Design a binder for this molecule. Sequence first.
Ligand SMILES: NC(=O)c1ccc[n+]([C@@H]2O[C@H](COP(=O)([O-])OP(=O)(O)OC[C@H]3O[C@@H](n4cnc5c(N)ncnc54)[C@H](OP(=O)(O)O)[C@@H]3O)[C@@H](O)[C@H]2O)c1
Ligand SMILES: Cc1cn([C@H]2C[C@H](O)[C@@H](COP(=O)(O)OP(=O)(O)Oc3ccccc3)O2)c(=O)[nH]c1=O
Ligand SMILES: Cc1cn([C@H]2C[C@H](O)[C@@H](COP(=O)(O)OP(=O)(O)Oc3ccccc3)O2)c(=O)[nH]c1=O
Ligand SMILES: [Cl-]
Ligand code: NA
Length: 314
Amino acid sequence: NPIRVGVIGCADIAWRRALPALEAEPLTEVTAIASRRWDRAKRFTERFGGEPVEGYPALLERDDVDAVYVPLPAVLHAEWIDRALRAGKHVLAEEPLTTDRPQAERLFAVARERGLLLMENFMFLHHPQHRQVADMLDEGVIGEIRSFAASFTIPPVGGGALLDIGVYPIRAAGLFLGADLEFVGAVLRHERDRDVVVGGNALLTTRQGVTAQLTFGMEHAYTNNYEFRGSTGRLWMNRVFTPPATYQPVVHIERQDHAEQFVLPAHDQFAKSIRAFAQAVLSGEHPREWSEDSLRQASLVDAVRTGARDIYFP
Ligand SMILES: NC(=O)c1ccc[n+]([C@@H]2O[C@H](COP(=O)([O-])OP(=O)(O)OC[C@H]3O[C@@H](n4cnc5c(N)ncnc54)[C@H](OP(=O)(O)O)[C@@H]3O)[C@@H](O)[C@H]2O)c1
Ligand SMILES: Cc1cn([C@H]2C[C@H](O)[C@@H](COP(=O)(O)OP(=O)(O)Oc3ccccc3)O2)c(=O)[nH]c1=O
Ligand SMILES: Cc1cn([C@H]2C[C@H](O)[C@@H](COP(=O)(O)OP(=O)(O)Oc3ccccc3)O2)c(=O)[nH]c1=O
Ligand SMILES: [Cl-]
Ligand code: NA
């Protein structure tokens, strides 16, 4: 008996990743899609099934809905996740969960009181390539880790590039370097014209001095990678955040006089993360690490927003 999923917001990202996945996943059934415009709802249900609903409250009211996918704009997550939890729906919220740490704690508290799952959807965490990369690092392939770089940049209620893009490299640092990451300094470029963060660069460190240099933005050519400098080599990889389901990662390693590349298996991370959500909802095993990782994440992001030097242009 698959969990019945309602989607609120007919997002691009739901159109391209989440709904195809929801659709293909046995453990989940798309029962309802809601849109500010009935026609858009409808364009979406013709594609992926379910009842097209106009407005989001109406979908929260349905009894044929156990869980809600929220691919809305970041600044609008808090209202709707909070409303979906209050209607008794478990929630799968696109990254970032929300805009700040204190709002993230409140959404988790609302969920905790009702025993509902609130999961922040970082598709990338669900791709086995990261763990294959981490096992190589643990095996010593480049000796001790000295520092980490990650970059996600792309060509040009809005999030801004910190919230919508910066979050990836920052989560990757969190994933690889651990829970003690502290802000050191960052810069954020803001476009005066539309008043919006369009890119930036952050520097973090663990307490042992393993630094992370994270780049993000939307005024750039596409890059989507990370790099580990160790005491005896380096390791980098491309398409680390959004590898296609059929794309085979290639781990690049260099050491003195020697370089290697390892091709890894293809994996559907969007499928796997929908499956992970469905599993946690069906079993009621809601891993604590997830919510504690989201809280820590939200803190580094607030740390970056606040502590960054902000620069307006021109
Ligand atoms: N493409 C991206 O920008 C991007 C990149 C990485 C991550 N994400 C994450 O995925 C989530 C959604 O982004 P997306 O890329 O799929 O963006 P999108 O196409 O803007 O989707 C936002 C959707 O939310 C609904 N919405 C409700 N109020 C809105 C408003 N005032 N203005 C615009 N849309 C409104 C709209 O759905 P209805 O019209 O059907 O109501 C719209 O289709 C965000 O959390 C984002 O951080 C997005
Ligand atoms: C391959 C590729 C993409 N894009 C553009 C196309 C698109 O605008 C953007 C991201 O493409 P993707 O990494 O595929 O990420 P998702 O669409 O899954 O979702 C996100 C959207 C925005 C932020 C992050 C994820 O870069 C390019 O400009 N060049 C490329 O080679
Ligand atoms: C799934 C997932 C994890 N985490 C947190 C929870 C956990 O703290 C961390 C990773 O979760 P896991 O993918 O199970 O761990 P592996 O060893 O397989 O992958 C590694 C890959 C690289 C380096 C370390 C581990 O992210 C989340 O916040 N959300 C999620 O959806
Ligand atoms: Cl490559
Ligand atoms: Na600041």
